[PDB]
Amino acid sequence: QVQLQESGGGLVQPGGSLRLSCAASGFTFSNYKMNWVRQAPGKGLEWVSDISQSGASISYTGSVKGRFTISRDNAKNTLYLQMNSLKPEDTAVYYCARCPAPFTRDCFDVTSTTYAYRGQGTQVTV
Amino acid sequence: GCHVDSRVDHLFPPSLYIFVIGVGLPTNCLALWAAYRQVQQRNELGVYLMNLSIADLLYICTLPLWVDYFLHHDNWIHGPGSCKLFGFIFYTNIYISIAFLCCISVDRYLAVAHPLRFARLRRVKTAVAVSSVVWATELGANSAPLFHDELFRDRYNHTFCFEKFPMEGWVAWMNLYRVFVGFLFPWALMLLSYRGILRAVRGSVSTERQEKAKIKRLALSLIAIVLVCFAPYHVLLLSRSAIYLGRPWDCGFEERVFSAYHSSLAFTSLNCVADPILYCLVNEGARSDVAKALHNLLRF
Amino acid sequence: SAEDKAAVERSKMIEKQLQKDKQVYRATHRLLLLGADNSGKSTIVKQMRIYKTSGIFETKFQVDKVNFHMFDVGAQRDERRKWIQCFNDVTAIIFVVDSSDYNRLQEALNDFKSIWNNRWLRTISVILFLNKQDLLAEKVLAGKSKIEDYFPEFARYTTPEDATPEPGEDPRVTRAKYFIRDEFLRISTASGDGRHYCYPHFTCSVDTENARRIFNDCRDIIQRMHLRQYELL
Amino acid sequence: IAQARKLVEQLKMEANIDRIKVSKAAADLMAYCEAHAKEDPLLTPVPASENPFR
Amino acid sequence: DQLRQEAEQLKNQIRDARKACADATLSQITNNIDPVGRIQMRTRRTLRGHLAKIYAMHWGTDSRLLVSASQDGKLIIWDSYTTNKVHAIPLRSSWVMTCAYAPSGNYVACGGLDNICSIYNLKTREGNVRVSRELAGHTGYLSCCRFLDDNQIVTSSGDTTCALWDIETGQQTTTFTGHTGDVMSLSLAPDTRLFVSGACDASAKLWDVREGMCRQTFTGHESDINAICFFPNGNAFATGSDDATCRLFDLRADQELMTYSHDNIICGITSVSFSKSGRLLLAGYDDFNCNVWDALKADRAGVLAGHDNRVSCLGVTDDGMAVATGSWDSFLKIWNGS
Ligand SMILES: CC(C)CCC[C@@H](C)[C@H]1CC[C@H]2[C@@H]3CC=C4C[C@@H](O)CC[C@]4(C)[C@H]3CC[C@]12C
Ligand SMILES: CC(C)CCC[C@@H](C)[C@H]1CC[C@H]2[C@@H]3CC=C4C[C@@H](O)CC[C@]4(C)[C@H]3CC[C@]12C
Ligand SMILES: CC(=O)OC[C@@H](O)COP(=O)(O)OCC[N+](C)(C)C
Ligand SMILES: CC(=O)OC[C@@H](O)COP(=O)(O)OCC[N+](C)(C)C
């Protein structure tokens, strides 16, 4: 039932601009605070950024700050992440994740080795 | 007994007693309910609180008869048998409220300034040992009146109760014991304990300035209300005792302190209305408990 | 009624034993130790024991004749969104973070955010232990790794007057230390509503005074709890 | 690699099982509920004479 | 990537079959049913001997003795009828998540964060409780170790693996590693041949004790599943999850057949149980009160509102005479109707 599918990616030269989409099915898109994760070659899962149910609260990792942005579309059940000023050190498999429980402000295991509420992910290369 | 003065002893004490009976029985009942709730949640404080209310309710349940007394210009119309019961419960309840008020201060100081040390002294079962050794000691150490005549009769139509202005030595040493041991020592204990609490609060890294000053104001009000209510009467009692032991104008002085004495013993009853507010209604948690009780009552 | 009387007698003995256990239970305080793989929580546990797939380890220590139970999670999977709910009545949570490693510091910040925002951890003060300060100082002195790349907001940061730099401490090291401390305190104060507080401490793996800090934090927490309980706060 | 093969197998095992109609598995928990409804102390309370928790 | 495509095709086939079966809804076959009505269960007896939050309990076969586990580290066996405490077993690890009573009443099992289920014998000739057996081998926290007989215990652990153990030899007789998240609780069917468990992935699985393979899987929930119980007949089970919605699943249907949820209800479900008919699905909630629903019409039947903290453990006697609730206020409460 629960399924998160990520769309977008492909090879890009340093400094390009892309947009990654995230479609979710099975749960209610609104009640769940969602994030973005990335696994990079030779590295572990890294917490990129988050967006809450309302969408009026955001947080980014400084490495992707000033460059990437997060938006939500509850009606489309779709999350969007813009990539700008892409650097070669931002090449990885990007995963779409949601916080375990709804109406909840804490998300503990979003960055675990195995997480039962994360999508397959898409390989963004630079 | 030298002739006495009753200009304002006819209205003011009766009015204050009626006011307390009107705003004291409700509020003390609410305080008693909240204290029982606190003990229901295994809190030692409630044990001290409950008893206090029980004392106040036993002081307010005797004031009607003293209003009757005063309205007839001291004329008791109920016999000595009632002046042996309702007089004891009316003079000893002030000194039992003093005692139970001091227990709360010691408990709060031990809890705040010694959070991890005295668990044994902070159970709901070491509070039914102190709450009983206080109720016994107050009702035994203030029992001398029960051995003497209460109903004295002067020549000006005035019958009496527990009071003979041509005072006697037993009354003298009882008044002195009441003034120093009864009232001042517990008050100083309360002041010291609240000072300890405030100095402990001042060191809290997790308490903001607003909360620290709110605690300061609450403690200062609690300490000062006792004084405002009781000192006006204890000072008069001490002055009477000194005048009688030295006997400068053994009669004259007594003529001009009838109304003052009877109006100062009525200000004391004001401690029965301040206690249920400062200890139950002021606090937001106990106020919410009282409001839950009112919500339940409204739908019964 | 002999069988019934024996049953009530046995119940009375069990009640007496449970009362003894009650007195013992209120005589000790429970603390939860948490940290990442990089954080030297194991070293702290070793240096605080001076007073098989077990899953959980227990450390019994004593400070000022006050007993303290520390529980460290062992052979348990990475997932922690469920068993953490067993630690909803602990006196405090000691969180250990590696300030030297700028990378993975955001992971520690996110873990602290999750702990603070957890519903069942809203009434438990968290003791913050910024560990491995010597390594952070050496890294700052070397200059090979720059905090600006990981934290672009560090460039504008200035050491606050509230800061108390140690004797013989370079301004850069203290600036970075207090920048990370303010990063933690921002999250601490964002959701704090008077029922939750943090205790930022600068600690090292080789430190004999961590127990004193933990005892002081527990004293303050219980003092606040008594203040609220005894109708004063 | 081999965790996908195992999941494929566990998805064939689960796709080769016999199944029955929903209204035939829905009107059976119904008959079980109806045939054991006069013996439930919490749905049809027992009087205060045979109740052990009086 | 071929295996992933094959798995997707198989999942699509599963969905198509389950849809092919679904013509009507439980609600329709049950619209012609008289509602249960308001349930006014009241607290008859209260147990206050426990110290800390209770986390697990299990009714005995005799419906007279109950076992309760409390995180103070105490397993108390109470006599419900007379309120007397039959036994009090101190535990080595204060953190206990599960406890079970043997069908014969001779053995009591407990387990928690220690990754061990400990079994104590109550029928010792000396009359004193002692550690009869300790079972280790799980790499996660034990969430539910239940009994099948005196010498065989099935347990669920936080390593995404369930186990069947022979208690005489003390080794893992059978292992189940089909889940992908923390298994939270399992329920044994009365037939004592199949058992259904739920994991922290919105997934419940049916397992066979004798064979040792997954039979059926159900993924109708959104959030993690915390409670599971078998409907009396053994052909259905109720599930509670953190998403604040309960569901009813049937083994033969192989798909969800009921959902119990409400807009006002925002908290999840910690423990669920059925009644002796199956018409009263009782369920704990984090809102500090239990709710009993009509399992056939999804109509709220009653609310047990007496509790100061989260209700953790729920139990129903074998004869359905009383309902026992244990919450985090260190009080167990026995509720019965009038
Ligand atoms: C046992 C737990 C609930 C702690 C609280 C115990 C309270 C309710 C008990 C202990 C001491 C008791 C008091 C002891 C003596 C007296 C004097 C008598 O002339 C009136 C009743 C009164 C005032 C009692 C009322 C009940 C009392 C206040
Ligand atoms: C009983 C009747 C006749 C007199 C009542 C007097 C009351 C209103 C007075 C007496 C003592 C006073 C307190 C004494 C000192 C302080 C601390 C100050 O920083 C704020 C006000 C505060 C907290 C006062 C509040 C009002 C107070 C409680
Ligand atoms: C540990 C605790 O909470 O107990 C405190 C309690 O002991 C204090 O009460 P006392 O000061 O002894 O009362 C004296 C009253 N007096 C003088 C007889 C009128
Ligand atoms: C009742 C009795 O036997 O006496 C006990 C008495 O010691 C309680 O009063 P404390 O609160 O401890 O005063 C200390 C306050 N301090 C330190 C000055 C700020």
Residue numbers in the entry:
A (entry chain N): 1 to 126
B (entry chain D): 8 to 307
C (entry chain A): 6 to 56, 180 to 361
D (entry chain G): 9 to 62
E (entry chain B): 10 to 347
Task: Tell me what the authors wrote about this structure, in their words.
GPR4, a prominent member of proton-sensing GPCRs, commands particular attention due to its ubiquitous expression and crucial roles in endothelial function, tumor biology, and metabolic acidosis regulation. It maintains partial activity at physiological pH while achieving full activation under acidic conditions. Although GPR4 predominantly signals through Gs proteins, it exhibits remarkable coupling plasticity across G protein subtypes, with the Gq pathway demonstrating a distinct pH-sensing range that potentially suggests an alternative sensing mechanism. Our structures reveal an intricate proton-sensing mechanism driven by a sophisticated histidine network in the receptor’s extracellular domain.
To elucidate the molecular mechanisms of proton sensing and activation in GPR4, we determined high-resolution cryo-EM structures of GPR4 in complex with Gs under both physiological (pH 7.4) and acidic (pH 6.5) conditions at resolutions of 2.59 Å and 2.36 Å, respectively. Comparative analysis of the Gs-coupled GPR4 complexes at pH 6.5 and pH 7.4 reveals key conformational changes underlying proton sensing. At pH 6.5, the protonated H10NT rotates toward Y163ECL2 to form a π–π interaction, while at pH 7.4, it interacts with E2627.29 and a water molecule that restrains its movement. At pH 7.4, GPR4 maintains certain features, including interactions stabilizing the conformation of the N-terminus and ECLs. While most of the ECD maintains similar conformations at pH 6.5 and 7.4, ECL3 exhibits distinct rotational changes. At both pH 6.5 and pH 7.4, key histidine residues (H10NT, H792.66, H165ECL2, and H2697.36) in ECD undergo differential protonation in response to environmental pH. Notably, our density maps revealed multiple associated lipids, including cholesterol and phospholipids. Of particular interest, we identified a clear density corresponding to LPC, previously proposed as an endogenous GPR4 ligand. S2005.57 forms hydrogen bonds with both the phosphate group of LPC and S1123.47. Y1163.51 of the conserved DRY motif also interacts with LPC, suggesting a potential mechanism for allosteric modulation.
